[PDB]
Design a protein around this ligand. Structure first.
Ligand code: HEC
Ligand code: HEC
Ligand code: HEC
Ligand code: HEC
Ligand code: HEC
Lengths: 43, 207, 445, 156, 149
């Protein structure tokens, strides 16, 4: 219902300063956290 | 001084009593500041891909059976079919350009419990929990209501009272699922056998 | 006789009225300046704190605490003095407390205010402290009642209340007196309407008997609480595994520290509440004389424990507890403990000379010095065995920052700031019972 | 909290009976292990390595009565059955799992191969793009014995 | 922390108490922070100073000056000032510059490249600027306690 992002008072640790996969990364050209791998790499 | 302050204990008492009444019949603490229908970049409209296209959920929400924090799909999934099915709309030119470029689709999200309380769908789904219970009945949902709060006090009611919810794992992703009668006793025989033993502790998700 | 004053029942009302009659003091205008400036320095560094982080205080991790909680034990240990001369002195019914009592729970309640701020603020996450309370919160979570840091909360959130409600009830006849004066002689006609805290007072038989048994009740029902409040605030130390804390004599001890701290400040207030704005006829100097005994009681009961500490190091201590007190005397804090124990022992055993040293000016220069050891007593006992505890790896001196000291100072600031504030509004002396106890209120005439 | 405690009291009984039937099996295997590997291995810690679990398993039986009787004594508290049942199944599946870890080493010395019927043997998490564990739990469940592990070694 | 001495953020010179008590320097601490004297060692007219710390292990007439720690670094990011009401200097370890600046003194250029680990001819000069040097342990030598046995 409450169409906006709802009030969470303590935003201390919701959006951690580190970023998990599939999350915004405000550094790179493509705003993206994955940074896909170079070809030829092997697990 | 004043003659009719016999009425003054009333507003002292009653307004103090109403202090309790207004406190507890007003809280709605994780039900009012949770639910919302956000405006995406394109509207996905789960209604259409599910409610009249008959797709189950593992198609584009892959890695929910095996991973933790299952993925929103890439753009590539839409390019399976929306490369050559529609090719017309002024609704997903972001999508076609995104496959033709590198800027991924600017997806907002919901259910974002904090990243100090981890979670794993596969730990649940493989053990028989359905999306009707937790992410709501999506089959008729143009945009996400997040009808469940996904807060702890509700997250934990299942880990204390699980057998009211868990599914038999046969066709778990079925929004039109009424469970059977004698549901509970048909379930506890699995917790006796499958031995799921849900967590009650701090170690599980908060680390 | 225990008050020296050529008074009758009326002579107090004209006088304490003159102490609350008109609003034009000048020394006030200086105290409310320097004290509020002290309070300004407090919050100037206390929100500077929370926007930034705890470590601006001088706390390393072994000594996690430093001066703030030290001051919490101070600014609550200082306060038990006021409530117990309201309670104890009625239990033993020495008929003697009346000259000073009503000014004392002030000296407690404001101490408890500037005390309680520390547990709310030496934490790093202040905003997330309501979790500490047992509210059925937004999840199925509740606090942990095996934690004396929680007992402190209920204790102080009860001790602020019981001491208040026992002080507020203590001062009903004042508001009756002032409500009675506001009509015929006083500030305004609209001070009467402010004095509804009288709560329909008439001094009747039907409820005055009840007032006595209630004052009896809270006496015999706040003392069992006082002996649990500061004991809780000692339990937090001694419950631990630290050798300098786990010694079990501490809860009686710190209580005696609260005596030997609190009266060591009340005398500082009474001296300065006796020179310029004083009651020669009601604050009899013989009162302070018989006051410093119960100080000097704890001038030696505090001393006996130091012997036990210093003894059990030689009797059956752990090889760490053996070292724990050699640290206290010999080590970094030799400036503290040698002088502290000596300060808290010399001056009391140098106190009783000229029949308890009735002389008033010695009181100020001594009552300070008796108290300065208390801030050391809790900076010593807490910290001197909190480093050098069960490892050499956790050996680290405690360097207190320049913000540690402005909070200490600010605690004096808010104390005087708010102690003076209501004190100028409420009456100082327990004028109800003064004229009711020692003077000719007795029916034998 | 659906209908009280008396509902769960049937399944908690159904767990304790599995334990009682395993008193036979574990103590039966404890005979068989002394018979199978008489001298084919060190066996001095390694046999007692199997016995050390056994005194715990039997100790829990008297407890599983005490656990249970504290529930059936008063059926008015739902927050004890789910827990006593979560404790039993864990204190049960553990001892099943601890029997196995000591029993797979038996084959590990008699056979030079701890067999490919040992465990799920799925792999790490990045080996899910190839092999979801779903496949594995249908391998492990439908292949691995809980306590038919050494009777299986009667076939060897 | 180095394993020898739990030292961080500064190059050092470690030596015996017998040379220290025959040279005139110490690792005195009256605040549990190890205030330190200096050396101002001088080789061929290429002298620099550094904190002297002491260890009861090393032999006569020898000091093990560790390298690195004197490596000037040039920053592209700002120093990130915030108001005096806010703490940044104590926290923003990457703030005042990049890290390698001024953490110690550079020592590599002093030696002779013949057998280029050792060196002679350090006309030591116990001079001032006696500044801090920080550790985690801060102490040592348990008093016969049960911690290693
Ligand atoms: C089938 C039964 C399920 C499907 C399909 C999905 N879920 Fe879940 N889910 C839950 C939470 C608390 C989150 C947030 C994750 C986080 O913040 O770390 C999610 C996440 C998703 C997502 C992606 C959104 C995201 O990246 O956060 C998808 C597509 C998704 N879930 C689909 C909670 C639960 C839950 C209650 C236990 C259950 C049973 C499921 N989710 C199961 C399914
Ligand atoms: C692709 C064709 C999809 C199908 C079929 C289903 N989902 Fe969906 N889902 C998809 C996208 C691209 C998104 C992003 C939301 C947006 O902003 O448009 C979603 C969203 C969800 C969510 C919420 C996740 C979030 O954004 O925080 C959930 C819980 C979810 N989807 C679940 C779900 C289920 C259970 C489905 C089948 C029953 C299903 N989705 C279909 C992509 C696609
Ligand atoms: C093939 C299996 C499909 C996949 C994969 C996805 N979509 Fe789809 N989508 C599909 C059809 C057949 C239709 C049309 C049905 C109708 O009611 O007209 C759609 C429709 C949409 C729309 C609506 C377009 C509009 O009305 O303007 C959108 C916005 C849409 N689809 C988005 C979408 C996305 C973002 C997908 C991947 C995440 C996706 N679809 C997958 C068939 C298929
Ligand atoms: C049913 C309605 C559930 C809800 C809602 C949530 N969980 Fe769950 N969870 C459920 C079950 C039946 C099980 C046990 C499966 C088994 O075989 O063990 C679990 C287990 C977990 C675990 C397991 C520990 C792990 O593997 O790391 C975790 C961490 C967990 N659940 C987390 C979790 C969170 C964070 C939830 C809400 C926010 C949540 N669960 C809800 C069933 C249900
Ligand atoms: C999942 C497996 C959890 C378990 C078990 C426990 N907690 Fe929980 N907690 C969890 C989530 C997903 C959330 C977020 C709710 C929200 O407000 O959005 C929480 C919340 C808390 C909090 C409050 C944090 C806040 O920002 O308000 C606390 C203090 C907390 N949880 C503590 C806690 C403890 C002490 C638990 C067991 C020891 C515990 N939680 C269980 C997830 C889960």
């Amino acid at each position: 219902i409450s169409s906006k992002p709802p009030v969470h008072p303590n935003l201390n640790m919701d959006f951690q300063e580190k970023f998990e996969a599939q999350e915004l990364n405000p550094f790179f050209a493509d705003r993206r956290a994955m940074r896909p791998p170079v070809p030829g790499t092997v697990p | 001084f004043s003659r009719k302050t016999n009425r003054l204990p009333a507003l002292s008492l009653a307004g103090s009593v109403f202090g309790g009444v207004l406190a507890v019949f007003l809280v709605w603490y994780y039900f009012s500041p949770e639910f919302y229908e956000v405006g995406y970049a394109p509207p996905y409209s789960h209604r259409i891909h599910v409610g009249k296209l008959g797709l189950d959920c593992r198609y584009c929400h892959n890695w929910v059976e095996v991973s933790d924090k299952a993925n929103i799909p890439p753009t590539q999934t839409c390019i399976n079919c929306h490369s050559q099915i529609l090719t017309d709309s002024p609704r997903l030119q972001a999508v076609r350009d995104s496959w033709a470029t590198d800027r991924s689709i600017e997806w907002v999200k919901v259910h974002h419990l904090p990243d100090y309380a981890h979670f794993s769908h596969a730990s649940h789904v493989n053990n028989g929990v359905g999306c009707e219970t937790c992410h709501g009945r999506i089959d008729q949902m143009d945009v996400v209501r997040l009808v469940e709060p996904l807060s702890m006090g509700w997250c934990l009611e299942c880990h204390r009272q699980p057998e009211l919810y868990l599914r038999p794992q046969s066709e778990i992703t079925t929004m039109g699922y009424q469970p059977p009668a004698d549901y509970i006793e048909r379930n506890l025989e699995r917790i006796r056998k499958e031995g799921i033993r849900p967590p009650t502790n701090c170690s599980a998700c908060h680390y | 006789v225990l008050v020296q004053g050529g008074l009758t029942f009326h002579d107090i009302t004209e006088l304490v009225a003159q102490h609350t009659e008109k609003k034009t003091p000048k020394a006030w205008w200086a105290a409310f300046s320097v004290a509020f400036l002290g309070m300004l320095t407090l919050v100037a560094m206390l929100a500077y704190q929370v926007w930034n982080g705890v470590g601006v205080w001088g706390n390393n991790i072994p000594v996690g605490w430093g001066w703030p909680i030290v001051n919490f034990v101070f600014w609550v240990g200082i306060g038990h003095a006021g409530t117990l001369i309201s309670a104890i002195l009625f239990l033993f019914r020495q008929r003697w407390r009346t000259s000073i009592n009503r000014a004392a729970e002030a000296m407690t309640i404001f101490a408890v205010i500037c005390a309680l701020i520390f547990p709310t603020f030496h934490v790093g996450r202040v905003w997330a402290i309501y979790w500490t309370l047992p509210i059925p919160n937004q999840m199925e979570m509740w606090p942990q009642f095996k934690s004396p840091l929680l007992w402190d909360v209920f204790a102080v959130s009860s001790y602020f209340i019981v001491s208040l409600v026992f002080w507020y009830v203590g001062l009903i006849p004042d508001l009756a007196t002032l409500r009675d004066r506001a009509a015929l002689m006083g500030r305004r006609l609209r001070a009467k309407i402010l004095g509804f805290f009288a709560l329909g007072w008439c001094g009747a038989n039907r409820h005055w008997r009840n007032y006595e048994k209630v004052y009896m009740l809270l006496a015999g029902l706040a003392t069992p609480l006082v002996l649990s409040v500061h004991s809780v605030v000692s339990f937090d130390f001694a419950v631990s595994i630290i050798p300098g804390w786990h010694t079990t004599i501490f809860p009686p001890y710190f209580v005696a520290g609260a005596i030997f701290s609190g009266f060591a400040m009340v005398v500082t207030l009474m001296v300065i509440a006796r020179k310029a704005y004083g009651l020669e006829n009601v604050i009899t100097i013989d009162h302070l004389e018989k006051m410093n005994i119960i100080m000097l009681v704890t001038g030696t009961m505090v001393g006996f424990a130091y012997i036990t500490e210093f003894f059990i190091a030689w009797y059956s201590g752990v090889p760490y507890e053996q070292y724990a007190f050699i640290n206290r005397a010999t080590g970094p804090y030799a400036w503290a403990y040698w002088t502290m124990m000596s300060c808290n022992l010399i001056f009391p055993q140098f106190f009783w000379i000229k029949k308890l040293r009735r002389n008033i000016p010695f009181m100020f220069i001594a009552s300070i010095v008796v108290n300065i050891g208390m801030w050391f007593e809790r900076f010593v006992i807490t910290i001197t065995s909190l480093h050098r505890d069960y490892l050499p790896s956790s050996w680290d001196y405690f360097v207190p920052t320049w913000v540690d000291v402005l909070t200490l100072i600010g605690s004096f600031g808010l104390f005087f700031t708010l102690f003076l504030l209501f004190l100028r509004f409420v009456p100082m002396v327990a004028i109800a019972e003064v004229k009711g106890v020692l003077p000719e209120a007795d029916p034998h005439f | 909290y659906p209908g009280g405690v008396a509902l769960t009291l049937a399944q908690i009984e159904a767990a304790s009976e599995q334990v009682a039937q395993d008193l036979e099996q574990a103590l039966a295997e404890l005979e068989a292990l002394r018979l199978l590997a008489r001298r084919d291995e060190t066996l001095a810690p390694y046999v007692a390595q199997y016995e050390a679990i056994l005194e715990a398993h039997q100790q829990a039986v008297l407890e599983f009565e005490h656990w249970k009787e504290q529930v059936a004594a008063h059926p008015g508290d739902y927050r004890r059955a789910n827990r006593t049942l979560g404790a039993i199944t864990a204190r049960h599946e553990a001892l099943l799992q601890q029997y196995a870890d000591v029993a797979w080493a038996v084959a590990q010395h008699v056979n030079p191969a701890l067999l490919a019927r040992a465990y799920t043997s799925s792999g790490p998490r990045f080996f899910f793009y190839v092999v979801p564990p779903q496949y594995a739990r249908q391998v492990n469940e439908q292949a691995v014995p809980p306590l038919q592990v050494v009777r299986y070694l009667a076939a060897q | 922390p180095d394993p020898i001495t739990k030292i961080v953020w500064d190059n050092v010179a470690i030596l015996s108490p017998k040379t220290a008590a025959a040279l005139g320097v110490k690792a005195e601490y009256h605040k549990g922070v190890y205030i330190a004297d200096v050396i101002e060692l001088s080789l061929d007219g290429r002298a620099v100073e550094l904190p002297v710390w002491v260890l009861p292990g090393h032999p006569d007439d020898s000091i093990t000056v560790y390298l690195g720690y004197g490596r000037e670094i040039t920053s592209t990011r700002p120093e990130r000032k915030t108001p005096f009401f806010d703490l940044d200097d104590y926290t923003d370890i990457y703030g005042h510059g990049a890290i390698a600046t001024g953490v110690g003194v550079n020592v590599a250029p002093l030696r002779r490249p013949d057998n280029t680990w050792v060196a002679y001819g350090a006309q030591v000069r116990k001079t001032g600027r006696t500044y801090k040097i920080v550790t985690t342990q801060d102490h040592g030598s348990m008093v016969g306690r049960p911690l290693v046995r």
